[PDB]
Design a binder for this molecule. Structure first.
Ligand SMILES: Cc1cc2nc3c(=O)[nH]c(=O)nc-3n(C[C@H](O)[C@H](O)[C@H](O)COP(=O)(O)OP(=O)(O)OC[C@H]3O[C@@H](n4cnc5c(N)ncnc54)[C@H](O)[C@@H]3O)c2cc1C
Ligand SMILES: O=C(O)c1[nH]c(O)c2c1c1c3ccccc3[nH]c1c1[nH]c3ccccc3c12
Length: 522
């Protein structure tokens, strides 16, 4: 008895679960298959970006993520040091969770949540629809659905699943991308690293006021990378480059204290810059790492994935419900790929900054002699814009879609200063508190939304144009002059994904035309 569902999600990692959460919130029947048993032994992701947090706010898991265990009094600072407990060279103070100032561009700042805490949270939200220890072996595309063979790794039995759509969130080495014959050429040189996970129970006490979330080491050529405090209560991770030495000894070399150290893992990995040439073929799609990979310098990886998952989510649901034009699905690649590429190049800039930084001779000496060399280095660090690696609002919220379903404005793209909120066509509708408890972002996520800051003339006609096409629409009349200034126009049409599709002080004459354009039937 072949099981059938609307969407088959290949991958139980961060990105596949987010996609499951989005389909769930859109009444789309779905099923997730994860080959592993779903537990985490070696945490990869630690920082949940703000944009991801906004989507989790909508899905109702943001709060549990923040109280998952990260200490509210632990420093979020990043610091360049010769060795942990050695000599400081440059620090970027970022407060603590309970201490930093409330952000103004968003309702959900970033959070610290190591993957072994995030997985249980996500599994519980996705619930019953997640199937662990299940591996997808192959898939055959038929006329109106995809047929896949799933091996139950528990009993050894194989079952078949017929779904209208097959979404592959199977990671960087996506077997699915290969079976379809799609190539994801490296845009930059591939590198190799080792990540050592360990427990150090008294390290925090010893560091006292010098405790940090990130310790960028400037010891040797292999040790010029971050040592991260994963859970703020004993767990740390040291990344080391490889162009042989014992695990424990590498950690001893990086940590200048005689304190208890317990090595747990020593995982080798490849940092790559690979984006797929195409994000789909037939009823089979690629999302997350299977579509785009980038250097972890900046922490953009999982966020760009969750972003693409949310994009595909509303477009899949629209085609399944019937109101989507035949050309809607193809905009997933049209819109997400360019974002993947630009985010990759920005991650590379951060990477090259520490790869090309030089480690002067007497950087380790004691006394004002070497202190002068450090002051020199710290100086160059400032000018190199190192802090851009730990403060990338533009990369988090500044991507603007320039596509066939977006009525873009003339204004081209040429950075002339730090990123600022914009309600321009293609961008993420900016945040503003309507009330102490409600954000403009809380109005988006379901169907199309039309914000009117002035006269509601024409709105009635907008409603009919959408109803005529069975396209879901919600009209909100807002007064707040502050929000009007931010959005700039009197009427703003926001897509189901929170991005602007059109804006103007006067609704257009051919509303049926606008409705057809924004739905992919242009
Ligand atoms: C050292 C390091 C640190 C990082 N830190 C961060 C960070 O702080 N923040 C951030 O945003 N990003 C971070 N990233 C990047 C981030 O980890 C990735 O972007 C993210 O994991 C991609 O998620 P994914 O769901 O697409 O795939 P993955 O997490 O790679 O998961 C793929 C899943 O597919 C499953 N699977 C594969 N094949 C099959 C099959 N045939 N059948 C069933 N299941 C299958 C796997 O078992 C796995 O669970 C980091 C990366 C590295 C290397
Ligand atoms: O995600 C990580 O913790 C992580 N793992 C890693 O291996 C990294 C990083 C991060 C990171 C996380 C949030 C904000 C900024 C960041 N820069 C780097 C970062 N920069 C690097 C440069 C070289 C090798 C590894 C990393 C690396």
């Amino acid at each position: 008895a072949p099981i059938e569902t609307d969407v088959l999600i290949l991958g139980g990692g961060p990105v596949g679960m987010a996609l499951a959460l989005d389909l769930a919130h859109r009444q789309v029947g779905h099923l997730v298959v994860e080959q592993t048993d779903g537990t985490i032994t070696h945490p990869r992701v630690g920082t949940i970006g703000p944009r991801s947090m906004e989507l989790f706010r909508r899905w109702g898991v943001a709060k549990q993520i923040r109280t998952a265990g990260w200490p509210g009094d632990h420093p979020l600072d990043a610091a360049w040091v010769t060795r942990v407990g050695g000599h400081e060279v440059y620090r970027i103070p970022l407060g603590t969770a309970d201490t930093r100032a409330t952000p103004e561009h968003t309702p959900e700042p970033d959070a610290i949540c190591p993957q072994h805490w995030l997985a249980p949270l996500l599994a519980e939200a996705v619930g019953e629809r997640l199937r662990t220890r299940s591996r997808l072996d192959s898939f055959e595309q038929r006329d109106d659905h995809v047929r896949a063979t799933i091996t139950d790794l528990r009993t050894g039995a194989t079952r078949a699943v017929h779904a209208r759509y097959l979404v592959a969130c199977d990671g960087a080495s996506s077997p699915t991308r290969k079976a379809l014959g799609i190539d994801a050429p490296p845009r930059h040189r591939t590198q190799v690293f080792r990540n050592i996970l360990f427990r150090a129970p008294e390290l925090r006490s010893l560091l006292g006021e010098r405790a940090a979330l990130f310790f960028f080491l400037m010891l040797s050529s292999s040790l010029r990378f971050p040592l991260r405090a994963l859970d703020g209560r004993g767990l740390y991770r040291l990344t080391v480059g490889v162009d042989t030495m014992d695990s424990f000894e590498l950690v001893r070399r990086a940590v200048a204290f005689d304190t208890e150290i317990e090595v747990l893992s020593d995982s080798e990995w490849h940092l790559t810059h690979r984006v797929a040439d195409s994000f789909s073929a037939g009823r089979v799609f690629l999302t997350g790492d299977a579509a785009h990979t980038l250097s972890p310098s900046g922490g953009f990886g999982m966020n760009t994935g969750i972003g693409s998952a949310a994009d595909l989510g509303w477009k899949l649901a629209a085609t399944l419900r019937g109101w989507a034009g035949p050309g809607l699905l193809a905009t997933y690649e049209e819109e997400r790929r360019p974002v993947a590429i630009t985010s990759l190049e920005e991650a590379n800039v951060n990477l090259r900054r520490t790869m090309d930084r030089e480690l002067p001779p007497g950087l380790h000496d004691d006394g004002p002699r070497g202190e002068r060399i450090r002051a020199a280095v710290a100086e160059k660090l400032e000018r190199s814009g190192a802090r851009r690696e730990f403060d990338a609002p533009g990369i988090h919220f500044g991507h603007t879609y320039r596509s066939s379903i977006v009525c873009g404005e003339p204004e081209t793209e040429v950075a002339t200063g730090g990123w600022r909120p914009s309600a321009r066509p293609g961008a993420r509708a900016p945040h503003a508190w309507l009330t102490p408890t409600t954000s403009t972002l809380d109005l988006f996520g379901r169907g199309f939304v039309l914000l009117s800051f002035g006269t509601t003339d024409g709105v009635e006609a907008v409603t009919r144009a959408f109803a005529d096409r069975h396209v879901p629409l919600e009209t909100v009349t807002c007064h707040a002059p502050e929000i009007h200034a931010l959005y700039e126009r009197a009427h703003v049409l926001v897509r189901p994904d929170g991005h602007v599709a059109w804006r103007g002080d006067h609704l257009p004459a051919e509303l049926g035309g606008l409705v057809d354009k924004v739905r992919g039937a242009a």
